[PDB]
Design a protein around this ligand. Sequence first.
Ligand SMILES: [Mn+2]
Ligand SMILES: [Mn+2]
Ligand SMILES: [Mn+2]
Ligand SMILES: [Mn+2]
Ligand SMILES: [Mn+2]
Ligand SMILES: [Mn+2]
Lengths: 297, 297, 297
Amino acid sequence: DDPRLLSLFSAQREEDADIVIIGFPYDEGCVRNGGRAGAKKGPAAFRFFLQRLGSVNNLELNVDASHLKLYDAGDITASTLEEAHEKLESKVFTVLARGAFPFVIGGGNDQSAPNGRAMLRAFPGDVGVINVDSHLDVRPPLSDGRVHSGTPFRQLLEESSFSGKRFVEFACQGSQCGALHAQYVRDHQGHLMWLSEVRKKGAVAALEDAFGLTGKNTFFSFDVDSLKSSDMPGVSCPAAVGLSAQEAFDMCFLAGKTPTVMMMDMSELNPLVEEYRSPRVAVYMFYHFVLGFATRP
Amino acid sequence: DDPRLLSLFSAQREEDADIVIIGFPYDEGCVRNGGRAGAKKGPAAFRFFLQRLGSVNNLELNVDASHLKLYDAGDITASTLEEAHEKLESKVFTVLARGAFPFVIGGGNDQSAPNGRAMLRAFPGDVGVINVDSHLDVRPPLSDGRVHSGTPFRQLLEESSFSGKRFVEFACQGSQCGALHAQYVRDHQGHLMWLSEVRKKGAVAALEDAFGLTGKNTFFSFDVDSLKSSDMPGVSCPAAVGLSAQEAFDMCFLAGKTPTVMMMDMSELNPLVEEYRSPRVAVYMFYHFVLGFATRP
Amino acid sequence: DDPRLLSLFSAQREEDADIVIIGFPYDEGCVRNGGRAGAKKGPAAFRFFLQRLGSVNNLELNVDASHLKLYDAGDITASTLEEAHEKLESKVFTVLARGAFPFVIGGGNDQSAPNGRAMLRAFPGDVGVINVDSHLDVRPPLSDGRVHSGTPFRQLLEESSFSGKRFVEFACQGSQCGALHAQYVRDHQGHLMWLSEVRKKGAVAALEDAFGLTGKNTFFSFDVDSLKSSDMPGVSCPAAVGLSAQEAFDMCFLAGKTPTVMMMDMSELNPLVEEYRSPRVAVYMFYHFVLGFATRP
Ligand SMILES: [Mn+2]
Ligand SMILES: [Mn+2]
Ligand SMILES: [Mn+2]
Ligand SMILES: [Mn+2]
Ligand SMILES: [Mn+2]
Ligand SMILES: [Mn+2]
């Protein structure tokens, strides 16, 4: 007598679904970036609470998502991290190509590079990207060329088909972001929206501004370590300060109802660090996105 | 040289006390509702910090509670959950009957049904009830008729002597409350005060509004899982978002000084989930109620 | 490609440094005050993250601290707590005497007495002190005369060379502070700035007021249990309510740029209670002080 998210998984075939969930159970990217392992367990933890949470008809927000059809495409499987990237990008692109909405649960933030490449191919020369993250993630590769959880947006800014003017680093933190990396983003004409500015404007208002810059066909990329660890402790790099759970929910809801947002990912959920509260927040974030999506034209 | 709550337990006999604490060390109600066991340890954990916290003369709030007399009536003891309910209701009623204030520490939220029945009998046809809770708790019984932590306010709304117009669900959350259960409360003319509305108005202001609806002889029923788990992690169902510890304190203080509030309970404290920070919050909540009570005519 | 705090430890000799870190790895003071042991591990935990955190050039706040030179003078070593106090005071005074800035990481709050005595000797009859703390810490010694983490500011208020008019208890909490101890501070003409007043004014604004009272040569003494345990759980006495991590950062930044602040300590960090999130907050607090210091004339 209380239908929740699980009740929306009514599509017998993937192609019938409005939103397709794809899992990326890898954290080698995190370890390469010197982070704590654990994010490979994120998708499993997310699914666990995906089965339990989120009233489909939300009378507080006045949104009924009963009409949406969700499908779980399972995890990307590969013998190397780099092959996993290839298969993830390919999977995401196919979902985009038929006009469905792919949501990717990680796993390390390195997932965002393949995800971004899927976008750039689905909407040639017309893509926008926002990285919600306390960190810029424009670090160089490892000396042997290897990519990691800290390089995905350097990889995307280096794409010739992508305009940096439409890249926003959202809720980034000056205490954690280097002058060189700030310069790199800004020299690509990308935008830095510091945490303090987000809080001064209000999270939703600032995100609206961000969506104004990202424009059409926006990749909404959410590193959950942008949330204060008081709400979101289960990540490799716990934030002392950052977005609240409510700000996160409110932001995801906006993303959902914003017609230009064409895909979303969520990185850095680490059940080894904390396994109950954090995955629940991650699921509620997706839930708020689903509600917002329910309202879009 | 720093008298605290313990110093107020000066009443040699129960009948001399302004406020009587009653414990309900049961969590079978929680387990029946599919929750995590542990709340049966709540009263013991509460008592542990009851011995240590709360300056009797609070110079920040400018309230001296030195004149109040507290008494600990111990725990309700029974061989079944249902018998415990009977004995709890009977104990609470006797306390109400002689005009003392009963405070019941749980234990699962199922305690609120017997507590409510004590009220309805002490103030026939003139009772008000507010459920501070992220959940509505108007779930049906189990298929075999058994009651649980999720049914107490369905049980009270079904009471013929109780006017639903005077029932408030306070700080409830749309993400956790079903359309059917919202309908049930509203069809009984009960009121839904969503978390977002509480925060928009300010917690104390919204509670004043709530007390205006509940009217005379109000049962102030506080499920501590209405608090964000960042402050209150030690509950069966941890809230991602919700009331802050300060909002909770402020609310309890208001309850205390509000002459129409005739009893209080506090459910869902689960030391198995978290055993130090959460019981301390629970004690400070009671403490703030005691201070407010110290000021009432 | 991302210089952080560690990069500032470029001074080959202690005398070349603008800021000297001194460790006080003792918690016997805490245990005497009936607290939980663990703070003796604070300095080690602080150092661990001192090696990893804090962008030297902060583009969010627009402060480059690249020019500052830090030096780690190691820990004070003694066979008794009282001897450790003597050696700490002596070390701190020498640092003050040559016009450098000593920062002491504890360890129990008893460190603040020797620290205060160093100040009173470096700036005879011209010292100000602010104790950022949920507690007043003006408790009497033990019956055998022994000092503890709860007596340091009674010890300083009893100093004949120190004007109480220039003592501020900042963010103290009425629920934890006794009427007698409030009277003691106020009878010495000291000032009580309750948490509620700090939050009403805004933390930075209230601290500016406090610095106005403390005047010249101010000892900025920060007991990290003044922070809400949601952000700062790793202390002997976890606060249910209190300062946020951001308020703490903002306050430390102000302290840093305030020319009258001549030394700082930080007490009660307890890695045994919580070992990852809390030390990180402690380091970020120091970091924000360092930035502010970078801007001062
Ligand atoms: Mn990232
Ligand atoms: Mn990040
Ligand atoms: Mn409940
Ligand atoms: Mn509840
Ligand atoms: Mn202290
Ligand atoms: Mn303290």
